[model samples]
Target: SMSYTWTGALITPCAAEESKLPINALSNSLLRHHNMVYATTSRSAGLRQKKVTFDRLQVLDDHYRDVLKEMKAKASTVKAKLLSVEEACKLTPPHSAKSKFGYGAKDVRNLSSKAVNHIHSVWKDLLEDTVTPIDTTIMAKNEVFCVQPEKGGRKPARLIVFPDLGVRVCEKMALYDVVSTLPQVVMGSSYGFQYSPGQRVEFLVNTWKSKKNPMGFSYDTRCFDSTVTENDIRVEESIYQCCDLAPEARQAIKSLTERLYIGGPLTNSKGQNCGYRRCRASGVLTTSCGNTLTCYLKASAACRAAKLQDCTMLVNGDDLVVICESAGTQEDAASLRVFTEAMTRYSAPPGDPPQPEYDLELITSCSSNVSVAHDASGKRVYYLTRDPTTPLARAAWETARHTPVNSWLGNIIMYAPTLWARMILMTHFFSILLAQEQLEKALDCQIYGACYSIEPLDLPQIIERLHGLSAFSLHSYSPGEINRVASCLRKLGVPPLRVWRHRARSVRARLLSQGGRAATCGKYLFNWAVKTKLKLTPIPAASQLDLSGWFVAGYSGGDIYHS
Candidate 1:
């Protein structure tokens, strides 16, 4: 038999705004509890709850309670900020009694706009701030593509056996995985380097070009040593390296780079079969640029068309042209002309009837429910369904999930009034544009060769660029990749947390909705359900601890194992 001991603690970082004295005061109190827990556990291997001594435990408990209460107060403040933003985006003004009835529908409209604008402003602020760390990490391993500076405004792309940038990449990969479990981990550090201003510009351009895919390869474009401290470094190294450094550290970096990555060339265990496998040709692919681009275009167009000026243009010559073009065949067009014989149909108002409004109480009540509404004329009807199974619904759900937290501020603002929502949405749209511009500039300043800023005319141009560049690509994805990207964008695009209040509005909406709420709760309850969902044998907790333990216990019930 073989065994090992694992020590775990809930690590907390002192907030930037927190006083040093307060932090110092809490340290001993906090450590006392941890020390007691360590002492109470028996040396012999068995699952047991350690009994707590009143005097010592009281200090620990009191400290924890105080810390928690303080944190709760802080969290409540943050949450309130978020809620205020959310309400502003969703709620519309009540001009008339009937107008109040349309609040729910109008709120959706308002929220989306506020969310967009708020996201933009936040993004702009982030770009302007120089000290803000664009946290980054390496998920898997590959030799860093290095650039050797040469004559002219360029550098030769060469794989440096041991590059400084590469060393950072390796360090980041290890550091990121360790820090992910801890508090104060900068959000973007997990994927790659901190995005500098130049890098941010590059990212924006790449993001826009690949806006369809909304993904790209990122390396040492940003840094995060500012956010991660020497103490963090020590703890990470100790845990990752098992106290001793250098050899284990090197090995960990190598292992991480070698073993745990997706969205790259796949190889056999020896790394011999490595090459860019045609992902689409392989059956493992799910989402494609086709779906992404189509959705993005539609959403963008919808947003644009919703504006007052755009709406006016849409109702005029544009509407007639659209109707004529979508008439299927000339015969269909001719057939529809039969309706023109009514004469009364042509005698209608020249423009949109009027802006419809809604009731706040009804809207709030039915916000969770599926319903439908019509245009002022009642000729054009719109169905609002809570079901996410539909394509459009799913797309919307996915987009909202990816929206950044800060962007939600627009939502809160818009909830107060329809005009506010529109204003914020416009602001956010521009902010996104600004971020893209900055990203482009960053790419231009790359030490390595920047991607050609040529306008891509076709798929061949894109493919050619991919073939020429050692850029990142995806082979696999986790659930909610888009949402993850959106979240990253919030932190990177915006400077301050306050600016992004509306950022995650859509994500929150989904979470708050009845289906998402129930589904989330159900997922947690499934494992602990009183009713036996399965004949799952309760394995010894320690026996099912590590990777090997899990393998031996056959937790996933697969036959594969290592000796």
Candidate 2:
């Protein structure tokens, strides 16, 4: 029997000036342009130069209490059951990082006694001891991108601290469901990922004007998770205490918090002790939930103290957008200063202090910019975009295994109308998938470390949700943008947009002629190819609750209601 496997050696960009095509025409093009791709610090990226510190003071009011009450009420209805060791072990991805403990992910999944017994011991330690913080291994992640600087080489590695496999399972048991569902119910549309680009803009506009005097601005907390004070960690624990949990569950929750949630010891790659931390760990179970809740609580209190009118918040982790009533320019300026002071008092100061924006479109969050552009057809298109550096990197990685998530797929779905995604990413990855004859294969991707399997056919529904109905019809591209795109393609040795257009025509024709799911893919993924397109069909899976059995529900602009 012949078997196919992918290795890191097989996953590399096209060599400079090399002529041989490795996988397909599209992959060759991407590899050629690989040098042009690099990650740059976002203009809105929080300050990274110095340790952010302030006196911690939490001022809770009726609004904060109300939000917590609703969160606790919703959490009570969650009925999140603890996963068995076997079940939890199975959830670990096959390509996940190997352990320093001498057993790999496969060993854990195979129920190796060493792995299982070690996991049990970790759990025993958690249940028995409460004061000692768990030790987490810290590593730098080299992420990929869709578009980046021409000269700047690789992006800076993000420091990630995660516990051992056994602790990770314990994390899943204690907080996975809470992190997934609680934020949406508590924050509603203010949950950033729960709205499409169009919906987000609309919500921002509506909320901005919901008040008579509207003053809108975005807040960036410097090193948000790292800045989480000991007090804030205890605040998070108090919120968890509100949840109606079994006695064992309560103890597990408490133990997990003390060991991992509040803070832990960091071990570097060289096996040296890097000292302990009191702030929230970026790779822990409750990172998202904890960040969102803490930010909201701090900002809400600040808003009240600042006396801003009709303040509405949109928070996804540390990326925060607040739309509220404006006073006169001077008064609004003073109010903003007060808001900043309040936030500082709460130990969450802005890296670049918050500036009031009269226009909602000017505000950036989640590193995405919402702006207007024309496609090749000259129709106005409103979309959310970041520098394509990250998306491009991920697309290259998708060429082989350990492909963490479908960010490339998600970008194409949300930004299919954009020139960069259409001419580069869609053309590149689809060509590789088409070459492998893996168009129908379900590949795993993640949001916040939660796994999801996505098929090529699912693009239609995702595209429809994120970019709206116009994604299929947009054709006009900005000349300046297209020129820049073309220049990068040429410098990188990739084919021009016209070549992608030709390939897309061929791919679309084959899918349509094949019919069924192929036709569905062509209809959505390549709808812009044809002048006349098929009617939009509903993605049956999109309507189901928790469709991915992962944390995608809130991340994809999908709604979740609790009784």
Candidate 3:
């Protein structure tokens, strides 16, 4: 293992400081927008510091009981099936970190004898050494801000613990399905990723208006994953105990908790043992599952205690949004204090205090804001959006190895109907991909550390999932937004958006001529250009969800169906 040293400014260089941009002129224009974006405090900031204690309020109504019952039932149906060594090895990304024991990801993926032997030895250690917690490596992470600015441009580096590849396999066997589907069932539409930008805005609006006195807001946990106490870890394990798992699975689960879940030693880049951590490690197999379950258990109970009326929650790990009936402005503010108190008592104090909002449009969650504006067709469109700082940063890094998440692609998928994503992101990235001749290349990106191989053509299916057919028709950028965009391009030494428009016309023509997925991509991504539009096709993924029983009407015009 080699240690790398840093010596200069970590921020991306200004356009003038760097040579010509990595992609075409249009790509350079898009990436340069990153510099113009700055972090701003949300409107909810004022409500964060008010003191509220949790000892005063507490409810276990049928709603709470039913949610728990459904969640448990979903967990029960998840049968634990172990993956074979080869299968687990195959899932290892080629770019995964190499083992200190002389095997690399490629070696493991190729099923080399040494890698297999090492993997088996690690599995044996897991089965035999059931008491010692696995050690984790911790490092600072430089990430973009959502609502809060990073101190000194850096948040705490995430702690990374590498379990033997074999243990990772066991983890997937026992928990992957639970992590993926359980939260969706427990939280339902509250699961942020489950909705497209349009649907999310629609849900927030409808949920806020569902009651006579609507109050809604989001919660932020302080150092969420790192704050998971030993007690919290034990409670998470206890939930698994309620599941009817095989004897081997029960033992393995317990073994994993004591060894990996509870806490572990921290190793730094110098390979020095930096004491031990009793709190939950950020890098582990059960991070998401543990965080979601723990957060839900605490919040659900707290919501009842706070007596939040008709409370509906969306919890993604520690990021929480509660939309419920308000008790009028004064009492609603008091209720929020009570809710904060309950959360503090539950050991999940807010990093930023909760700010209850009567207006749904002001409630921001998952870094997306609900805003109203007119599209090119002059119809009012409500869409979800955030500053494009992170997306632009990643777009600039797309030419390098170990790129961060493809924020540009994700933003486009989620906010394609929004002017910023469509008029800028789509035009820029497509131009770059087309110029690089990598339109068909399967590039890897992650959402919550889960990897997916994305192709350019997949944008159509993704857009359809998130924004429906409206993505193809939405056009027009606000003069102010477009002005900022133009200024950013000029400042960053890139061509103007009109150049992007020109390039898009060419890209759209080339794509439409190719037929199949290409034509679909061309139509959906660049349809604002053509007079005759392609008929909207049903997204296969969306169609597969059994929404009849699960669908919650009146949210997003009844377009939201729980999967």
What stretches of model 3 exceed 4 Å from their correct place? 1-28, 31-79, 142-161, 184-206, 371-383, 399-405, 475-503, 510-519, 530-563
TM per candidate: 0.15, 0.78, 0.77
- State the number of backbone clashes in model 1: 73
Each prediction's Cα lDDT score? 0.22, 0.64, 0.60
Per-residue alpha-carbon lDDT of candidate 2 for residues 136-247, written as tens digits (9 for 90 to 100): 7655444444443452433343445678766776676565566666667666777775565566666765675588877688888866766677777777777776665666
Q: Candidate 2: where is the Cα deviation over 4 Å?
A: 1-28, 31-34, 38-81, 99-102, 110-117, 145-155, 193-202, 205-214, 371-383, 393-403, 416-419, 461-470, 475-499, 513-516, 531-563
Alpha-carbon error at 26 in model 1, in Å? 52
Candidate 2 TM-score to native = 0.78
Better of 2 and 3 by lDDT: 2
Cα deviation of 44 in candidate 3 (Å)?
28
Mark the regions of model 1 whose C-alpha exceeds 4 Å error after superposition. Answer: 1-163, 181-232, 239-422, 427-563
Specify the highest-TM-score model's number: 2
Task: Indicate whether candidate 1 or candidate 2 has the larger lDDT.
Answer: 2
Q: Please tell me which predicted candidate would have the highest lDDT against the true structure.
A: 2
Q: Is candidate 2 or candidate 3 better by TM-score?
A: 2
| Better structure of 1 and 3 per lDDT | 3
Each model's Cα RMSD: 32.5, 8.3, 8.5
Error of 3 at 81 (Å): 3.2
